[PDB]
Design an enzyme around this catalytic site. Structure first.
Site, PDB file in Angstrom:
ATOM      1  N   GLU A 112       1.143  -1.175   0.131  1.00 25.80           N
ATOM      2  CA  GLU A 112       0.031  -0.154  -0.073  1.00 25.80           C
ATOM      3  C   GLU A 112       1.007   1.119   0.015  1.00 25.80           C
ATOM      4  O   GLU A 112       1.880   1.225   0.985  1.00 25.80           O
ATOM      5  CB  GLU A 112      -0.858  -0.025   1.183  1.00 25.80           C
ATOM      6  CG  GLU A 112      -1.953   0.972   1.176  1.00 25.80           C
ATOM      7  CD  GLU A 112      -3.248   0.120   0.890  1.00 25.80           C
ATOM      8  OE1 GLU A 112      -2.900  -0.786   0.204  1.00 25.80           O
ATOM      9  OE2 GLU A 112      -4.329   0.612   1.185  1.00 25.80           O
ATOM     10  N   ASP A 158      -4.070  11.197   8.133  1.00 26.71           N
ATOM     11  CA  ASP A 158      -3.284  10.787   8.896  1.00 26.71           C
ATOM     12  C   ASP A 158      -2.537  11.361  10.077  1.00 26.71           C
ATOM     13  O   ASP A 158      -2.823  12.551  10.294  1.00 26.71           O
ATOM     14  CB  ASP A 158      -1.976  10.840   7.818  1.00 26.71           C
ATOM     15  CG  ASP A 158      -2.003   9.777   6.753  1.00 26.71           C
ATOM     16  OD1 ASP A 158      -2.001   8.604   6.842  1.00 26.71           O
ATOM     17  OD2 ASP A 158      -2.108  10.386   5.454  1.00 26.71           O
ATOM     18  N   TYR A 173     -11.248  -2.157   2.441  1.00 26.42           N
ATOM     19  CA  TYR A 173     -10.405  -1.672   3.441  1.00 26.42           C
ATOM     20  C   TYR A 173     -11.070  -1.473   4.689  1.00 26.42           C
ATOM     21  O   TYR A 173     -11.969  -0.772   4.853  1.00 26.42           O
ATOM     22  CB  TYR A 173     -10.018  -0.354   3.055  1.00 26.42           C
ATOM     23  CG  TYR A 173      -8.707   0.312   3.831  1.00 26.42           C
ATOM     24  CD1 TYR A 173      -8.804   0.328   5.315  1.00 26.42           C
ATOM     25  CD2 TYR A 173      -7.522   0.768   3.233  1.00 26.42           C
ATOM     26  CE1 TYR A 173      -7.810   0.961   6.336  1.00 26.42           C
ATOM     27  CE2 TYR A 173      -6.336   0.869   4.116  1.00 26.42           C
ATOM     28  CZ  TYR A 173      -6.496   1.161   5.389  1.00 26.42           C
ATOM     29  OH  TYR A 173      -5.699   1.531   6.207  1.00 26.42           O
TER      30      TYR A 173
HETATM   31  O1  LIG Z   1      -0.899   1.345  10.434  1.00 24.99           O
HETATM   32  P1  LIG Z   1      -1.690   2.962  10.412  1.00 24.99           P
HETATM   33  O2  LIG Z   1      -2.447   2.999  11.574  1.00 24.99           O
HETATM   34  O3  LIG Z   1      -0.902   4.012   9.855  1.00 24.99           O
HETATM   35  O4  LIG Z   1      -2.931   2.703   9.234  1.00 24.99           O
HETATM   36  C1  LIG Z   1      -2.470   2.283   7.928  1.00 24.99           C
HETATM   37  C2  LIG Z   1      -2.512   3.382   6.897  1.00 24.99           C
HETATM   38  O5  LIG Z   1      -1.333   4.091   6.918  1.00 24.99           O
HETATM   39  C3  LIG Z   1      -2.120   2.916   5.447  1.00 24.99           C
HETATM   40  O6  LIG Z   1      -3.180   1.989   4.879  1.00 24.99           O
END
Ligand SMILES: O=P(O)(O)OC[C@@H](O)CO
Ligand SMILES: *Cc1c(COP(=O)(O)O)cnc(C)c1O
Ligand SMILES: *Cc1c(COP(=O)(O)O)cnc(C)c1O
Ligand SMILES: O=P(O)(O)OC[C@@H](O)CO
Ligand code: NA
Ligand code: NA
EC number: 4.2.1.20
Lengths: 390, 267, 390, 267
Positions: D49, D60, D175
């Site tokens: 990904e 984010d 997702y």
């Molecule tokens: O592992 P995390 O919390 O950063 O979540 C995943 C996303 O960065 C990407 O799919």
């Protein structure tokens, strides 16, 4: 000889050099004439409504009074154009100046609010404005000085004496003593020689008139008391005037207690000074034992007038009004409380009035009482002061 | 006592006008102010006009504002002024001594008590600068009970009612203002004062002393020619003090030269 | 599925992560319900009147227009509590938050005026307020930051990205993405995802409604044009909304031209940017050629929103409204002119609107025209800025 | 191509879940990011990904905000990202490559043109983080015309209508969000996701990859046990980059150790 009584009991008068007496008599006659003139009254009302933003709101403060039997309203002079009640009377005085055919304005100022007010009225109405300001005050009020100049007024620092408000008051009178044929002296409070105490009250009395109508509409009765700070006495007499004949309504005026009356560092001449003759009038003064005039001290720059309007000394003497004092720390506490509980930033001047209302509530929380505080101005100007203390 | 009346009689016998200097008591210190005053008299002053330092002298221009500032730097108080006055009277038995005061210093400890103190030390008159005729009643009454002449200003913008009042109420001399404005030697009055002077004499007012802006001999002779009994000069004198602070001896010499010249012009 | 159309032509939409869609649908439904609820409408009107000071004056400016055939009025949002028009819509949004049972408020702010506004409404109405602000903006708006804290809000500096308004916008949305069950996001302009453009217009539309009634009373006809600055679009859509169906009334919006459009240092995305998708909506954006979002530049801190409300992009596309720009020097000149000729200190934001009116007058002084400028705020906050330039 | 379908078939034959790391392309520079990616694959990643640096990554948390800041400090642009992607595909013919994008970068030069570019370089899927199903029509249509799987997020607050939409519209994988909030390894989702997972399978949705907060082996095995086809981990990977910026060699060793461990947990 005058048309109206220059005294409130023993207080007031016209203690100016003889050369200024024709100017005072001329002003008194112009005022008496204007007050009967429907066109002058319509013109004044139009500027008050469409330029200054009258009527101002009457705001109920339920978060402040929760848990008590006090109901408290604030009369919102902080929402008037310029941010303080001074705008009402400078507009009327500007119109009196034009009625007499004068084209120039002289004014004094301490904290600068009167100078800004005088400059804005003079800009609107086409008058050439010069302002006297103690050099110590010029140094500590750079924002106000710049506002005056942006509005086209000339600001003249005064270095004589203590270089603060009283010395600007003197310099204004020295100028007028030589320029009265072309210039009107736009005095900043309900004090000085007659007819000023009377004209300034009448050009502020819409504060109390609106309050009365507003409180009758919202509560169906008059207040138990109306409360206002007292620097020179204008916002307080404007709130009190319409209620004087309503004997059930308390009139409480609040002078600045500074660091505490016992310290001598205060600005409470009405209750803690001594009667003298200065600035054209006989009234309670801050002064030494030998008679030299002294400054008023307060955390709030605008409660600096070292005397008080003769009408307040008279209302006190006959017991129609009661006067008290509030210290710097009490005013600061009231400022913080209003900001946090009602989202209104009050001027530190007005905070003295609100602090005394809060004491009336807190000291007897089960007493039923309907109070109005005159919120004479907004406190955005005071945030640095308050920040630095805190 | 009748010191002004005796003076003006004497001067009339010599066809002379009075020359009357003003200074602020205690400027620039008590001892030097006493010496200044003795010099003014020795050099020909016919009378004195004397100020008591005050915090807010609203009838005065910068020259006299500064004399007050200097006196305050020296710690000069009204009680010290009264002691000086007693001492001046003890040295000089006949010269008229007039005070030019601000109201608060007269009212402070009681109006009657102020006038009583003036009589005790030998003062002849008091002009209160910020008391117009309309407010003068308690001041003139107290003055007269203590054998003090109450002085009034006759301004250039005087109407007939004011002339009559001034003539009725005043004693000793009438203070004829040269012009509007505040004290100061820079600004000279130029208005014709002949009419006011005649009207005052018609109404049997106290004799007129012209004051404000008188700084040169020709203005003394002009005042006398117009019919005034004399002239007062203050800022001009005070400026000689201010310019000579560093040399007290030179200060007295220049004061002597100037007063002598101004007095000669009145003859 | 929504109750109301989320688009104005091609512009608008709901471009948020899926997790925030229930919060937007909940808000839209609460709003639709509130708008039909007489008790909500009465409560909103009461706060507007008795707390904020509505209606605001409509002031005629004859000194400015002398010698020309322009008649100019200013709608006085500078006299509203807080000093700018933002107070109207934060009070309505605070009430919507309570209607939905939320007790916490999140808001973003650039120049700080929205943060002060959000803090004051939250203090009055008993909501716990947290504010996001770019750290570069925190540093240059210390006064506003202190006002927010005096009013009991928590101010959280944002250091990501450019550390200015857009980054505070992001951080607010990141927080709400996790706290929407208890917190309402009190967005600061008529932009962002539906239903915000629509709610903010409806909670500002009293500006135009009052203007219409006031101008009909004073002149007996509608304006030839109403003119307002455009940062994100709230004060301008509040002035325009009630006149949209009055086809003879011009709607002119003024974006900041900064140092000049040709310099690229401006804040005029509606006429000089490119459509993109950001902050929940499809609208004209300040952005690089590759699609990275950029800042808006203006001498006025409050015209910093790097996009514009989708309703303005739509009104422009169909030619119902016209959009222009005014440079920093033109705004400064208008600020000086109002201070000196009318005694009113205008916000540098509002000065852009007034500058364009002055150009309409000066460029064709014999054209007869009745103009209203929305004076969106007061300029006491701008005097240092203006002093330093000058 | 049908890389996700081939992968999930293979994994099902081994009763294994997918382990799918996320990184931001170009963090902390192009060359190092290419090496990072090769290490992730060598150490057992089943798919990738990948993020494209953007000015305003509003889905984010701080860890990924910082990866974007690092990529921007290196001057990384979308066009450079596309060149990297082509190079990654040329090295690795079968691994599914999915992008996680912000809308403005897809819409910028034309939505259709974006999807066409993805097909040219070999990308298999695109998730646009700030496009909800309600706005997805032009994105999903463009994806499908260019043989790209459009990916949708199934949030924890999903209702039945949303599950049906997600199942109907999505391709490649679904997702499955672990929780509300934004990306970040600190914050672990703990909600039971069994029901959503069953409902998605009932509606024949693309196989579910759990993502957000997955930072440990036990969370990989938990996701697979609940019925998901695998799990995505981004912040946890990115933190290994951030903590090892000064030692690129140690950075790859630690990434290898972590991915190996996470992949072992899926078996
Ligand atoms: O592992 P995390 O919390 O950063 O979540 C995943 C996303 O960065 C990407 O799919
Ligand atoms: C000047 C001022 C005062 C004091 O003057 P008053 O004549 O006593 O009213 C009080 N409040 C405000 C806000 C002021 O500006
Ligand atoms: C915030 C602000 C603006 C800009 O915001 P809009 O949403 O475009 O109205 C304009 N004027 C003032 C005074 C402001 O405070
Ligand atoms: O000479 P002037 O102008 O100071 O005027 C005289 C006064 O000082 C005193 O009488
Ligand atoms: Na006072
Ligand atoms: Na904008």
């Amino acid at each position: 000889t005058t048309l109206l009584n220059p005294y409130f009991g023993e207080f007031g008068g016209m203690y100016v050099p003889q050369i200024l007496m024709p100017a005072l008599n001329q002003l008194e006659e112009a005022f008496v004439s204007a007050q009967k003139d429907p066109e002058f009254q319509a013109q004044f009302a139009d500027l008050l409504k469409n330029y200054a933003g009258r009527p101002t709101a009457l705001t109920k403060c339920q978060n402040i009074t929760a848990g008590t039997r006090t109901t408290l309203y604030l009369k919102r002079e902080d929402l008037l154009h310029g941010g303080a009640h001074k705008t009402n009377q400078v507009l009327g005085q500007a119109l009196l100046a034009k009625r007499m055919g004068k084209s120039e304005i002289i004014a004094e100022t301490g904290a600068g609010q009167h100078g800004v007010a005088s400059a804005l009225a003079s800009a609107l109405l086409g008058l050439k404005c010069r302002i006297y300001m103690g050099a110590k005050d010029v140094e500590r009020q750079s924002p106000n000085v710049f506002r005056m100049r942006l509005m086209g007024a000339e600001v003249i620092p005064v270095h004589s004496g203590s270089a603060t408000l009283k010395d600007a008051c003197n310099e204004a009178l020295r100028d007028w003593s030589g320029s009265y044929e072309t210039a009107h002296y736009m005095l900043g409070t309900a004090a000085g020689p007659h007819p000023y105490p009377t004209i300034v009250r009448e050009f502020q009395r819409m504060i109390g008139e609106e309050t009365k109508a507003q409180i009758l509409d919202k509560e169906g009765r008059l207040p138990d008391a109306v409360i206002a700070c007292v620097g020179g006495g204008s916002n307080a007499i404007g709130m009190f005037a319409d209620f004087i004949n309503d004997t059930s309504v308390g009139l409480i005026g609040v002078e600045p207690g500074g660091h505490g009356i016992e310290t001598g560092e205060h600005g409470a001449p009405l209750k803690h000074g001594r009667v003298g003759i200065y600035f054209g009038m006989k009234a309670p003064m801050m002064q030494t034992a030998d008679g030299q005039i002294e400054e008023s001290y307060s955390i709030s720059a605008g409660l600096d007038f070292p005397s008080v309007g003769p009408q307040h000394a008279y209302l006190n003497s006959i017991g129609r009004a009661d006067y008290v004092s509030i210290t710097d720390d009490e005013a600061l506490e009231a400022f913080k409380t209003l900001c946090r509980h009602e989202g209104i930033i009050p001027a530190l001047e007005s905070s003295h009035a609100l602090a005394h209302a809060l004491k009336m509530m807190r000291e007897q929380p089960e007493k039923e009482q309907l109070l109005v505080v005159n919120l004479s101005g907004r406190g955005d100007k005071d945030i640095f002061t308050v920040h630095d203390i805190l | 006592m009748e010191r002004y009346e005796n003076l003006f009689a004497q001067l009339n016998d010599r066809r002379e006008g009075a020359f009357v200097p003003f200074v602020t008591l205690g400027d620039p210190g008590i001892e030097q102010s006493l010496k200044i005053i003795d010099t003014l008299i020795d050099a020909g002053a016919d009378a004195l006009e004397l100020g008591v330092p005050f915090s807010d002298p609203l009838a005065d221009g910068p020259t006299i504002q500064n004399a007050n500032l200097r006196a305050f730097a020296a710690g000069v108080t009204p009680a010290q002024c009264f002691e000086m006055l007693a001492i001046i009277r003890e040295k000089h038995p006949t010269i008229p001594i007039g005070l030019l005061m601000y109201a608060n210093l007269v009212f402070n400890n009681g109006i009657d008590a102020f006038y009583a103190r003036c009589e005790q030390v030998g003062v002849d008159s008091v002009l209160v600068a910020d008391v117009p005729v309309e407010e003068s009643a308690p001041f003139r009454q107290a003055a007269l009970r203590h054998n003090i002449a109450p002085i009034f200003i006759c301004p250039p913008n005087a109407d007939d009612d004011l002339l009559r009042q001034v003539a009725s109420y005043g004693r000793g001399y009438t203070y004829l203002l040269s012009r509007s404005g505040v004290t100061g030697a820079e600004n000279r009055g130029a208005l014709p004062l002949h009419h006011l002077i005649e009207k005052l004499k018609e109404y049997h007012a106290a004799p007129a002393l012209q004051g404000f802006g008188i700084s040169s001999p020709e203005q003394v002779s002009a005042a006398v020619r117009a019919g005034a009994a004399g002239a007062i000069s203050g800022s001009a004198i005070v400026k000689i003090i201010e310019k000579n602070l560093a040399s007290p001896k030179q200060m007295l010499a220049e004061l002597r030269s100037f007063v002598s010249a101004m007095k000669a012009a009145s003859r």
